[PDB]
Structure formats: C-alpha cells, structure tokens
C-alpha cells in the first residue's frame, strides 16, 4: 500500500509499505528510495516521533497517511 513521506527538504515521496512493517523497515525503504542513511532518520506522525520496533499498524498509519521525516544531523 502507498503512504507519503515529507522529507526535510520538503519533497513529498511515495513509499510502498505493509501495515506490518516496523519503523525500522520503513527507514530501510526510505534509504533504498532516497539514499538517506537509516541512522539519520526520525519519523514523525501526529506530532509524535515513531519508535523503531513498532509497526505502522501499531500507530494507526493507514494507506495514504503522510509521515514527516526529520534528520539527525551530526558533525
């Protein structure tokens, strides 16, 4: 099923996911599609940051929901 992710640059991407996908799995998909390393990714839905070991289903993330992606920036 398709969901949306608005990246830090404001680009809204589509992603193909299963409700059973963990947030860790979603990060891997964003890496594959956009090249962003998983250790950088903070995913946010409904004003809360999502935890790696929970699933989209755990969060009521539906077909066509939109996540915000914010990056952990180090230097």
């Amino acid at each position: 099923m398709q969901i949306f992710v608005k990246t830090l640059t404001g680009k809204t991407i589509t992603l193909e996911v299963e409700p059973s996908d963990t947030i860790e799995n979603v990060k891997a998909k964003i890496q594959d599609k956009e090249g962003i390393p998983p250790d950088q990714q903070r995913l946010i839905f409904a004003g809360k940051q999502l935890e790696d070991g929970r699933t989209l289903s755990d969060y009521n993330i539906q077909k066509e929901s939109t996540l915000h992606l914010v990056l952990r920036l180090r230097g």
Partner: protein, 161 residues
C-alpha cells in the same frame, strides 16, 4: 524580508522545519569554526559567549551535561541514540565526540535560546532548516551544517538588521 517570510512547521513540540531556498552568503556571514570533533560546540560558543576563544567550547559541553541530566530522558531524538543517560554522558563528554541536533535541542532549553541548524546541499544552497525553540531567525543562534559532518556559526548580514 525574505528572512521575515520563512514558513516554519512545528513537527513535534518545540521543533520546527522550513525549506526555503537561498544562497547562505546572500543573507549570512559565515564564522568558520575549527574541527577536531568539536565544531558543534565551538559554533554554539561563538554565538552565545562574549569573548569566545578556542577553549570556550568546554563551557558549552558542561552546559550540555547539565541539560542532559534534566532533559535527555524525554528528548525524542534520544530514542535514536538508545543509550542510558550515564552511557550517553560518557560518550558526549569524550574528547572530539561530535555534537548534533540532540545536543541542540537540550541546549536550547538549558540556555533559554533558539537554535537553527541550516543544512546545505552539494549545490551549495540551503535547502532546509531545523529550529529548536520558538524564536525567529533574528533571535536565533544560527548554525550552518555542511559536508554532512561539520558545523560553522552564522550571523545575519547587517542590512537585514
């Protein structure tokens, strides 16, 4: 004016994002910082401490320690680090250990400031900013994150006030 029209979206409490497109040097002076792993704290020091020197960053690392003991447990980005408070502090305080958006969030609360981190693309222009705190760009401590690995300080150019 360009700077007065920035559109910030509060994504999680106290944390905002914006995706303006500008040449950094059209609006800011860059105040370059050394590395040795410390450039995040040097950049903070440059903009918050009068008479900043190359030793000032130790002060900011101590404030980061203080901040962590208050705020780390509840910081959303701390969930990425995944360390106990004590293990986090051990790493943070290590010589040349990189700072980050996690320390920016905690420092904004500890110091009572707004910190913006502007990140630059390979095309040289700013493509995004992350802001910790409620202040505007004119009030904020503005950092430039470049090469995906380095922080410098920025000051707004005088003609923009």
């Amino acid at each position: 004016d360009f700077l007065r029209s920035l559109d910030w979206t509060q994504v999680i409490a106290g944390q905002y994002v914006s995706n303006p497109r500008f040449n950094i040097s059209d609006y800011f002076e860059i105040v370059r910082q050394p590395g040795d792993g410390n450039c995040f704290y040097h950049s903070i020091a440059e903009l918050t401490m009068p008479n900043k020197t190359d030793h000032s960053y130790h002060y900011i690392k101590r404030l980061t320690e203080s901040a962590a003991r208050k705020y780390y447990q509840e910081e959303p980005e701390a969930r990425l680090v995944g360390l106990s408070l004590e293990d986090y502090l051990k790493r943070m305080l290590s010589d040349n250990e990189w700072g980050s958006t996690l320390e920016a969030s905690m420092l904004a609360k500890e110091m009572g400031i707004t910190i913006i981190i502007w990140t630059v693309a390979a095309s040289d222009e700013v493509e995004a900013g992350i802001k910790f705190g409620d202040g505007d760009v004119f009030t904020a401590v503005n950092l430039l994150h470049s090469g995906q690995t380095h922080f410098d300080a920025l000051r707004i150019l005088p003609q923009f006030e």
